Amino acid sequence: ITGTSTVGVGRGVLGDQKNINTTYSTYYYLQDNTRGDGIFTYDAKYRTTLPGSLWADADNQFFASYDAPAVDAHYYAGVTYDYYKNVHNRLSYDGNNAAIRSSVHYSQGYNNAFWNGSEMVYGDGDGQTFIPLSGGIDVVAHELTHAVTDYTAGLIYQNESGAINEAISDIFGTLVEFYANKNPDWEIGEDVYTPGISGDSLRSMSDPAKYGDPDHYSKRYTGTQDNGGVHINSGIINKAAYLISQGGTHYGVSVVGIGRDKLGKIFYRALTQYLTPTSNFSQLRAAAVQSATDLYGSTSQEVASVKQAFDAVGVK
Ligand SMILES: [Ca+2]
Ligand SMILES: [Ca+2]
Numbered sequence: 634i635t636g637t638s639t640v641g642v643g644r645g646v647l648g649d650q651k652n653i654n655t656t657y658s659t660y661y662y663l664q665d666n667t668r669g670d671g672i673f674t675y676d677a678k679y680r681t682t683l684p685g686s687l688w689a690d691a692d693n694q695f696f697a698s699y700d701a702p703a704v705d706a707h708y709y710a711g712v713t714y715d716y717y718k719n720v721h722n723r724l725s726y727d728g729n730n731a732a733i734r735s736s737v738h739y740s741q742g743y744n745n746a747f748w749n750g751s752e753m754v755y756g757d758g759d760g761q762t763f764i765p766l767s768g769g770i771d772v773v774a775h776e777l778t779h780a781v782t783d784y785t786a787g788l789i790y791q792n793e794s795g796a797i798n799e800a801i802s803d804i805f806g807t808l809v810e811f812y813a814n815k816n817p818d819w820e821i822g823e824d825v826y827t828p829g830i831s832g833d834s835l836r837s838m839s840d841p842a843k844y845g846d847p848d849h850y851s852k853r854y855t856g857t858q859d860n861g862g863v864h865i866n867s868g869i870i871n872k873a874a875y876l877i878s879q880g881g882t883h884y885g886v887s888v889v890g891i892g893r894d895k896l897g898k899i900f901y902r903a904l905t906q907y908l909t910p911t912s913n914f915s916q917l918r919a920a921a922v923q924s925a926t927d928l929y930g931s932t933s934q935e936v937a938s939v940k941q942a943f944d945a946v947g948v949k
């Protein structure tokens with residue numbers, strides 16, 4: 634669409650009011666011209682054909698409940714784009730300001746969200762297990778980070794390389810949650826998961842075992858489900874990343890925390906410079922160590938903590 638950039642107002646999934654960037658041309662569209670080549674949000678109208686219709690609204694006000702997921706998908710994509718640019722100097726997922734597209738209201742009762750290789754897709758949830766998934770900034774940021782990985786390391790979606798791919802998305806989705814200061818934690822999906830139950834989440838980075846995911850290499854899943862456990866074994870890496878950031882003692886191994894910022898710096902460097910499509914956990918450790926070395930020196934604490942963290946989860 635070609636039109637006039639403007640700002641509208643609406644309410645997100647959780648009922649919070651926010652301003653969003655829109656474009657005016659007869660209708661007001663969810664098209665944000667302020668970031669790279671734009672952020673565009675589409676209505677999939679409960680169908681599975683994609684992307685659907687670019688979101689059009691008559692009055693620049695998005696307070697209808699059908700609007701909620703679109704508002705959040707649109708807003709949180711902006712935040713994520715900001716994170717990457719401000720923090721890592723990366724312009725969009727491709728590093729070249731590629732347009733970011735998302736569709737909401739995908740299918741009916743669909744309890745998931747995903748990056749399909751070209752755009753983001755969000756289900757509305759069945760209302761019991763989930764509410765519309767775009768209401769979780771960690772979810773949005775996890776998905777958009779898959780785009781980042783696709784254009785960089787290109788980690789294949791299966792086995793260890795696939796678990797790394799998943800852990801990368803949880804790590805950065807959590808760093809984005811902290812960046813925006815939106816009730817941050819080391820949990821994944823807490824805001825949209827099981828509305829009826831307080832205190833839970835989909836996955837825990839601080840304690841993966843809490844939901845039955847492995848927190849040590851000796852406990853890894855070796856079967857074939859979930860693409861070889863990409864969503865299970867990511868727990869081992871998630872735990873490592875939490876320790877590097879926060880510190881702690883795990884299985885008798887002590888790790889001094891170096892904080893979130895450095896965690897993000899080290900992981901982003903590993904991702905963009907050292908990982909390859911077939912990298913395994915052991916290769917990830919080597920990459921993380923080389924990155925920290927690059928950034929802080931071989932005899933740094935940073936390096937030391939990265940080592941301790943992997944020893945703690947049993948990754949050699
Ligand atoms: Ca979270
Ligand atoms: Ca819940």
Ligand SMILES: [Mn+2]
Binds near residue numbers: 690691693694695696
């Ligand atoms: Mn309206």
Ligand SMILES: [Mn+2]
Binds near residue numbers: 776
């Ligand atoms: Mn994922």
Ligand SMILES: [Mn+2]
Binds near residue numbers: 815
């Ligand atoms: Mn949170």
